[PDB]
Design a protein around this ligand. Structure first.
Ligand SMILES: O=C(O)CNC(=O)C(=O)O
Ligand SMILES: [Cl-]
Ligand SMILES: [Mn+2]
Ligand SMILES: [Mn+2]
Ligand SMILES: [Zn+2]
Length: 455
């Protein structure tokens, strides 16, 4: 009555033939899983990456977490615990909370107890957790090249499901990006304890996310399919409007804990799963997800973008602009970078990039005609990729400029995208300059190179 568990998400058990290539597999399970938002992947029994670490030499600074529903939390972005001392803290917490041996507590009990304690205004439970990019003080759980590796570790060095390799595997379009997006293309490490949770969110630029539980007690997930993303946001906007005020920057995104039953009440489809050790969880583009840890564990997650994502990546940047939210990178700069590397691209990748570039060129053509009719006559080429991102964001909608922007001598250093020409300054239009990366005559050959590559 208190908590009705959402239905279970799809669970996939691929064979070795299927499991070999992750990108082919994901593209194969996409019709099913994009209807549920999240899905679980059980690797073949023989696939078992070795986990070896010294629990005494791995430290990390813990993050503190209050467990209150609808309360605002800042999203994690870019004394200490050793992994042993944290684990002793975590196990003692759960053991004392339930007065039971940590592993005799049912996962469904912890679930209903989590949703009890977060709604109860009386309870003041705070927990700690670890969340960070791999460093010298705390490295990846997967094998990496560096030290002498055992023959079994060498098996999994070049694996596709080694989340260190997934970003740069040449089917992830995030691989050829040279701009700094370290918080996006590098794996995150999550050290969890009982009730430690991650609030409702989607990935930056609506990218995929893949999560591997190396070891420990399960991680409980809740997922919402991408098509219901705005349904969920409406439900949340009503209950918690505090989360939807304009963010000063990217380090100030507000997220929250909210009961799935509340979403299911408003006809938002929600799915759940328990991710156990050695299992993958995959979230699809714009699929909202949240959850909590059943106890002491260690997870590793990374974002990635396939060819299927490219159109969504464009729609997302459009949506970011409507909301005046900062981008992590320029979508167009990425597209043009791949166009300039057409000869070395995968041919299916080149085909998809071409289609997106065709749309980009069509839009840019229309926008430049529009600003010309606004009086902007003067123009000059400008290498936007050389500018730090904070120096090339639209004054109005905060979008990162690459294809074009408008500048004015009256307001030096300031820029606006071509959607917000009126927002630059109070000077007449002939004082404006169109700053462009490419002429339309530069762009069509670039697209042609993609077409030839894709045959
Ligand atoms: O494991 C966590 O704490 C949170 N993980 C994610 O949000 C993800 O893998 O996409
Ligand atoms: Cl509470
Ligand atoms: Mn996530
Ligand atoms: Mn506007
Ligand atoms: Zn703008």
């Amino acid at each position: 009555s208190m908590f009705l568990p959402p239905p279970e998400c799809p669970v996939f058990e691929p064979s070795w033939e299927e499991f070999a290539d992750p990108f082919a597999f994901i593209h194969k399970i996409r019709p099913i899983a994009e209807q549920t938002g999240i899905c679980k992947v059980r690797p073949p029994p023989d696939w078992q990456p070795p986990f070896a670490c010294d629990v005494d030499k791995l430290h990390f600074t813990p993050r503190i977490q209050r467990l209150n529903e609808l309360e605002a939390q800042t999203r994690v972005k870019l004394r200490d615990y050793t992994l042993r001392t944290f684990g002793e803290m975590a196990d003692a917490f759960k053991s004392d909370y339930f007065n039971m041996p940590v592993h005799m507590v049912p996962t469904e009990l912890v679930e209903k107890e989590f949703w009890r304690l977060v709604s109860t205004i009386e309870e003041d439970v705070t927990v700690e957790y670890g969340a960070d990019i791999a460093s010298k003080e705390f490295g990846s759980g997967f094998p990496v090249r560096d030290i002498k590796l055992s023959p079994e570790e060498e098996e999994y060095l070049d694996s596709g499901w080694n989340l260190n390799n997934m970003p740069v595997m040449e089917q992830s379009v995030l691989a050829h990006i040279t701009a700094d997006i370290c918080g996006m293309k590098l794996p995150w490490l999550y050290v969890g304890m009982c009730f430690s949770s991650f609030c409702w969110h989607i990935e930056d630029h609506w990218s995929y996310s893949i999560n591997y539980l190396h070891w420990g007690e399960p991680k409980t997930w809740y997922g919402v399919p991408g098509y219901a993303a705005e349904q969920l946001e409406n439900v949340m906007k009503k209950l918690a409007p505090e989360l939807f005020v304009s963010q000063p920057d990217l380090l100030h995104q507000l997220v929250t804990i909210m009961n799935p039953n509340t979403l299911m009440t408003h006809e938002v489809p929600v799915y759940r799963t328990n991710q156990c050790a050695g299992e993958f969880v995959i979230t699809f583009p714009r699929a909202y997800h949240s959850g909590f840890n059943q106890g002491f564990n260690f997870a590793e997650a990374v974002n990635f973008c396939t060819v299927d994502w490219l159109p969504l990546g464009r729609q997302c940047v459009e949506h970011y602009r409507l909301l005046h939210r900062y981008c992590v990178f320029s979508h167009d700069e990425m597209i043009c970078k791949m166009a300039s590397k057409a000869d070395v691209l995968d041919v299916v990748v080149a085909s998809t990039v071409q289609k997106d570039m065709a749309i980009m060129i069509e839009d840019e053509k229309a926008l430049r005609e529009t600003v010309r009719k606004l009086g902007v006559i003067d123009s000059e080429r400008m290498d936007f990729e050389l500018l730090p991102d904070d120096e090339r964001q639209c004054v109005k909608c905060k979008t990162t400029c690459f294809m074009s922007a408008i500048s004015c001598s009256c307001k030096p250093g300031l820029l606006v995208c071509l959607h917000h020409v009126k927002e630059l300054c109070s000077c007449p239009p002939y004082k404006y300059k169109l700053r462009y990366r490419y002429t339309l005559d530069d762009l069509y050959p670039m697209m042609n190179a993609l077409k030839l590559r894709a045959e």
